[PDB]
Amino acid sequence: MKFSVIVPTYNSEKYITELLNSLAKQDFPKTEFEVVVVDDCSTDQTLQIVEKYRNKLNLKVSQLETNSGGPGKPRNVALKQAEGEFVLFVDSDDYINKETLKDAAAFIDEHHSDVLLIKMKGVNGRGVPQSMFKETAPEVTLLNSRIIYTLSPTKIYRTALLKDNDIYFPEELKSAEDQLFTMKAYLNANRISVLSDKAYYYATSPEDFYEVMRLIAVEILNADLEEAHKDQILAEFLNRHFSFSRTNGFSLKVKLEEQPQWINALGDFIQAVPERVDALVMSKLRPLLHYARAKDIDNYRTVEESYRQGQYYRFDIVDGKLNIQFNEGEPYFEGID
């Protein structure tokens, strides 16, 4: 088979059909794809609604004997069952365009992609990564595009890519586990493609979270790539992470007494990042990497408060940028813009 649509479900009764409908209206033979539903022990009758489609859709259904508390274990069970050449993970609260597997299969055979991103579209007023879906491109890398800014599994992966290199979702860690999954697939793919000719996918404690980030840093730095390139990929991940994750501004939002917990977990993540990589990151994040690596919340918070108020202990203006000293006796950080 060409594809395996993978659907993790838990109490998905209210909108599972709109998903299963989109899989039935596919301008693509039901002969060449399967829908692999693995239910995380739903109370309602999602699995009964899913059974209505067993005579129109090539259909596989399992149910876990107990709730795992996340989509990781459901997806992994579905991934091991899948026989299709390519795999697509879909949220039961979502649906896909009718041309999706039509256009993907056509694209895949032209350019034998290992990973194919398909352009997304938010419904009901739902934020969706945009910056990497402005062009269709049969070949993008982690360093010439913004694919690292979208790590959701709502993408098309070659099944053997995930299976040959043992890429599976974390089951033990349940915050942002999909980022480690898609990062691994990126680093292992020989060809990554972006297809944007239309909109295909429609979207409707810190110790676990930063354990995943530490594993991502470990995974980049041990990839089978050139040393200079590994450092640059990790720099781009840290740019994205400090701009868009919960790390951004945490010393301004998190309650003071919980902040030592955050700096300790963030520090174990940043201590896996060699200091040499700080020079590759956006200059404004270098002070944050510095005090995170030292696990110094007071100076970390001062930097973030200083940024937020535009108040600095001392600074110079050189080449239209700021060289900032955030506290007495602390180093100057240069080129901040």
Residue numbers in the entry: 1 to 204, 217 to 349
What is the paper's account of this structure, in its own sentences?
In this article we describe the crystal structure of TarS, an enzyme responsible for the glycosylation of wall teichoic acid polymers of the S. aureus cell wall, a process that has been shown to be specifically responsible for methicillin resistance in MRSA. TarS possesses a catalytic domain with a canonical GTA fold (one of two distinct A/B folds characteristic of nucleotide-sugar dependent glycosyltransferases) consisting of two closely associated α/β/α sandwich Rossmann motifs that abut and form a continuous central β-sheet. TarS possesses a D(91)XDD motif with aspartates coordinating a metal cation, a feature that is typical of the GTA superfamily. Altogether, TarS features a novel architecture with closely-associated trimerization domains connected by a linker region to three protruding catalytic domains that face away from each other.
Our analysis of the enzymatic mechanism of TarS was facilitated by the capture of various TarS1-349 structures encapsulating the catalytic domain in complex with metal and substrates. These include the native structure with bound Mn2+ (free enzyme), the UDP-GlcNAc bound structure in the presence and absence of Mn2+ (the binary Michaelis complex), and the UDP bound structure with Mn2+ (product complex). Native and UDP bound structures were also obtained to similar resolution. The structures of native and UDP bound TarS1-349 were similar to that obtained for the lower resolution UDP bound full-length TarS (overall main chain root mean squared deviation (rmsd) of 0.56 Å over 335 atom pairs), with minor differences in the linker region (320–349). Based on these observations it may be inferred that in the native structure, the SA loop is disordered allowing binding of UDP-GlcNAc, upon which the CS loop moves closer to the active site center and the SA loop becomes ordered, occluding the active site channel. Trapped sulfates from our crystallization condition were also observed in the TarS1-349 structure along two basic grooves leading into the active site centre, potentially indicating where the phosphates of the acceptor polyRboP may be bound. Kinetic parameters for wild-type and TarS1-349 constructs were similar, indicating that the trimerization domain appears to be dispensable for UDP-GlcNAc hydrolysis activity. The results show that although TarS1-349, lacking a trimerization domain, retains some processivity (133 ± 14), its Pintr is reduced compared to wild-type (2400 ± 260) indicating that oligomerization does appear to contribute to TarS processivity.
